[PDB]
Amino acid sequence: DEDAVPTLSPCRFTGSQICHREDGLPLAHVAIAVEGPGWAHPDNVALQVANAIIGHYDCTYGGGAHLSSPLASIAATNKLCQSFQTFNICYADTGLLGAHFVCDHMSIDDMM
């Protein structure tokens, strides 16, 4: 026990952008998120339900146009991406809440 045991200091979420441009790759990856509350917050359940409503998509999904999620359905119908996924990464007191997606160079705007 005793001396030399630190606690974790909170981590400042910044809200910024990091764009690694590389036209040599054939599909773009994009990951956007806002700051999440973290592990213990009861708010996580509701956050997880809204995410579930947006859900995920992948080009091998059966049922495209008829999918419940408007994102997925519009995505599937207009071929706006190859895949997307919502997420809620929890860390102590903070987190990443958002979605990630993969798409053609001319679809990033629409997908966003």
Next chain:
Amino acid sequence: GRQFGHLTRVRHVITYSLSPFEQRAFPHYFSKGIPNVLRRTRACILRVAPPFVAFYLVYTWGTQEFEKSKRKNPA
């Protein structure tokens, strides 16, 4: 034509950016600000100023010669 997505080809360049709600709109406004402007002035005076003073001299002279040509002494 035009449009993003079809402008040109670029690879290997990263760009770090920051939300405007996270930074100040006037960082070191006078601190770095004024030095810069002096620098820019210095960078361009020798190219911009000379024609203007040349006009200025021709302006004040030309004016004096006009006024002083319309008086007479002997003859």
